[PDB]
Amino acid sequence: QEVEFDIPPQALGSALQEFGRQADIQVLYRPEEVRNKRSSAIKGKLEPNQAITELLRGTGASVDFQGNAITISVAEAADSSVDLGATMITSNQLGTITEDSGSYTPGTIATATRLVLTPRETPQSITVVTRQNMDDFGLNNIDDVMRHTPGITVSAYDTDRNNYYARGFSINNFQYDGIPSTARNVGYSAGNTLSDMAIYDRVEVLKGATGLLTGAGSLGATINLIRKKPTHEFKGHVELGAGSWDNYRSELDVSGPLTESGNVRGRAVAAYQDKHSFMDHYERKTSVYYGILEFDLNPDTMLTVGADYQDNDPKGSGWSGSFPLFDSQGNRNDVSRSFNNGAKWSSWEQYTRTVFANLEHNFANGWVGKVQLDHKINGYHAPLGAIMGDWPAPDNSAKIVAQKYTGETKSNSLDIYLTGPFQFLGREHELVVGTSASFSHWEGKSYWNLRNYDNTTDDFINWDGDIGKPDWGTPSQYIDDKTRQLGSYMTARFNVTDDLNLFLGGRVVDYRVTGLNPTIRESGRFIPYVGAVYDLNDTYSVYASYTDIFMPQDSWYRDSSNKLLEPDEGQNYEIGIKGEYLDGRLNTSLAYFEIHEENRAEEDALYNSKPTNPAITYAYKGIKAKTKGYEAEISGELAPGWQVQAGYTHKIIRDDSGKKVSTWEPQDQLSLYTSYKFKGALDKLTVGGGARWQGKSWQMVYNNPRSRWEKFSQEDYWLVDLMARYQITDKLSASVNVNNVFDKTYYTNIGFYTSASYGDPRNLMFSTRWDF
């Protein structure tokens, strides 16, 4: 619909870059094709497709409309066969925005290499949860989104922290607009498990080994969250929602030009949610604010400054799971799903805020440069108190453990990169070169010396959280931890033939961890990157990649000799086929992958059964482990009103001995989510449902009162979701979500400190959205 335009005649390149900007649309185009071509003047209020055909008059070019993207091409009478993976330069460095796309499949994406590429072009497993998916299914935070992510298993630590698995591993890499955060441990990463979705366009998850742009981090995956950006036309909405257990949410999102010319633009969002829960005496208030402003210093240089903020604030938090597995005498414990071992006053409140600036420049090259500046705070305030141990006892009494952690982490980042195309042996390739620097500083206080507390409670079966609050006494410990990451990376994408694209690059990395432990250094570590994509027909391509990552170990992962273990590394080997249909409106992939891990910290039983060095009382051993598995997924349009996203993943991970590890992540999983928009008489009704299935999962846990190990099993289970929206009016709509339709009662944790958490019972959410 109609937009304000001002692009005067220039290099086709600038014109195109300037166009994507002015129109809020990603423009893809081939450097060698637009070289030495000229745009025609365009001036004023016009629809974006009249505008672009006017712009290209003279140039001999054609436009392919594809949702939030246009690709531009210049056909010849010649053409000796087609280069589907031709080097394309893009106008939006983070890829195609998903908001308003109507789709559950993404557009282009730079998650793997910083190069803007399509899921077909990307030689790695890349799953995206798109803005619309989030809207239809009510996914309001990162916990909701992960639960709907193909290939991801979400399990509980406690009411205020979950765990995310891919391919054998706990995910511990998070980025924001492509900037890695520091996530070493939970001090550094307060609120990462809790980010509200209000401020994001999409969440994009790279599976495998992602050292190339994460730098130091875990195996499994990266989770990359893209912030919502401001726009050239005014728009926004208000949303109010109401669900099971006194769950009320509201949300305001406003976007547009702040000056008559359009050269300064803004976007602002606020969202507030106060909820109780099926679990007894647990409530949680969350608040978020976000502001970003964009300044055009001139048509090819943009300055962006922004801030965001989220406060997660519960009552009735627990330390570890919702209740203890065994009682005092060693019998399995059996409780209601409402049972909550946390105390009334108990809280794991977690906060986060960012201030950021970026500057981005288009070189008259076709090259583009970008500087990214970040100040992040991850903070927490955690007076935890919760029933813990082998309780109840024969007389129905129980004991509380109560400790208090408060603290803050402040992080600063610089990220700078150059991206452009270049000719080598008569053909067009592209390159990213970039360097990065991060400094983050965790500080905190711990309280465990309680003064004159009586931690028994007389009644377990009817626990209510209604116990007194202790005197924390004086700080037991002072934390001070500084991490410093310096990175340098270079990926090159060579168009070798019309069907074959070769990827060659890597990162060089320097990582120093400093503070109250002995210094942990790693100078000059190289992380390689090898990939190739071979096109088979207009539909299918095959691909292969070899990818790496490592994480220098926590300071207490030492050995026999009191030496820190060499860093936990892994390599992903992946071969696959990916298929693209309806001009990129539908994507399919089947992959086979293998993860080789080396130096995975293992216990060391023989030593630990009777230590011989008081400096390490619990030494480890650095071992090896293997993931073998395969994954299939599909997303996009199955038919005109009909969208899906679905996947299927199979895995087993062992260590070189042979034992199955991460046995709680299931060996087989399946997700399918779908909605359908009726046409004709019912064209204002959208209907939707979904299912998630997973196979057996187990833990080995020690029954201390009976001095024997036990196996705990969660039998495979289905969860079914349902959904309907009705657009009553141009500007107002009403929705309902029903989750866990058949009220399946299942577990999300067994064995985490000898405890258990139930997943959500059936729940509903009502809401109205109002678009101005």
Ligand X SMILES: CCCCCCCCOCCOCCOCCOCCOCCO
Residues of this chain that bind ligand X (CB under 6 A)? 234, 254-256, 258, 266-268, 291, 293, 305-307, 355, 734, 736, 738, 743, 762, 764, 766, 768
CB of 307 or CB of 638, closer to ligand X: 307
| Spatial contact of 128 and 105, defined as CB atoms under 8 Å apart | yes
The pair of structure tokens assigned to 408 is 């803050």
**Minimum distance between the CB of residue 337 and ligand X, rounded to whole angstroms?**
10
Nearer to ligand X, 601 or 736 (CB): 736
Is residue 293 helix, strand or coil?
Answer: strand
Nearer to ligand X, 542 or 736 (CB): 736
Residue 313 beta carbon to ligand X: minimum distance, rounded to whole angstroms = 22
- 661 neighbors 702 (Cβ within 8 angstroms): no
Q: Compute the 3-state secondary structure of the chain and give helix, strand, coil in percent, each to the nearest 5.
A: 5, 55, 35
Closer to ligand X by Cβ: residue 433 or 764: 764
What is the per-residue DSSP string for 182-251?
A: P-SSTTTTTTTT--BGGGEEEEEEEEE--HHHH-S--SEEEEEEEE----SS-EEEEEEEEETTTEEEEE
Compute the distance between CA of residue 504 and CA of residue 490 in angstroms, rounded to an integer.
8
- How many alpha carbons lie under 13 Å from residue 679 in its C-beta half-sphere? 4
Q: Which is nearer to ligand X, 95 or 690 (CB)?
A: 690
Question: Rounded to the nearest whole angstrom, what is the least distance from the CB of residue 252 to ligand X in the complex?
Answer: 10
Choose between 293 and 687: whose C-beta lies nearer to ligand X: 293
Nearest to ligand X of 63, 355 (CB atom) = 355
Would you say 315 or 725 has its CB closer to ligand X?
725
Instruction: Please state the closest distance from residue 199 (CB atom) to ligand X, in A.
Output: 12
- Residue 422 CB, shortest distance to ligand X, in Å, is 37
Bridge partner residues of 691 (DSSP): 672, 720
Name the minimum Å distance from CB 722 to ligand X.
9
Round to whole Å and give the CA distance between 484 and 510.
Answer: 8
Strands (E) in 363-475, as ranges, are: 368-387, 398-423, 428-447, 456-457
Contact between 20 and 32 (Cβ < 8 Å):
no
Q: What is the DSSP string of 534-549?
A: EE-SSSEEEEEEEEEE
Indicate the pairing of strand 174-176 with strand 220-227.
parallel
What residues does 204 pair with on adjacent strands?
Answer: 128, 224
Residue 227 or 267: the one with the smaller Cβ distance to ligand X is: 267
Degrees (nearest 5) of the Cα angle 358, 359, 365? Answer: 140
660 backbone dihedrals φ, ψ, rounded to 5°: -65, 130
Shortest distance (Å) from residue 238 CB to ligand X: 12
711 Cα distance to chain centroid: 32
Min CB(732)–ligand X separation in Å: 7
Between 267 and 493, CB nearer to ligand X: 267
Instruction: Give the pairing of strands 500-515 and 283-298.
Output: unpaired
Least CB distance to ligand X at residue 735 (A): 8
Q: Work out how close the CB of 746 gets to ligand X at its nearest, in angstroms, rounded to a whole number.
A: 15
291 or 475: CB nearest ligand X: 291
Least distance CB 378 / ligand X (angstroms):
18
Strands ordered across the beta sheet of 169-170: 153-158, 161-166, 169-170
Least Å from the CB of residue 151 to ligand X: 30
Q: For residue 533, what are its two tokens? A: 């994509």
Q: With respect to ligand X, which residue has the nearer C-beta, 73 or 768? A: 768
Q: Which helix (H) or strand (E) holds 5?
A: strand 3-7
**Based on C-alpha coordinates, what's the Rg of the chain?**
27
Q: Please tell me whether residue 646 adopts helix, strand or coil conformation.
A: strand
Q: Measuring CA to CA, which residue among 391, 397, 398 is closest to residue 330?
A: 391
Burial of residue 546 (CB within 10 Å: 0-12, 13-18, 19+) is: middle
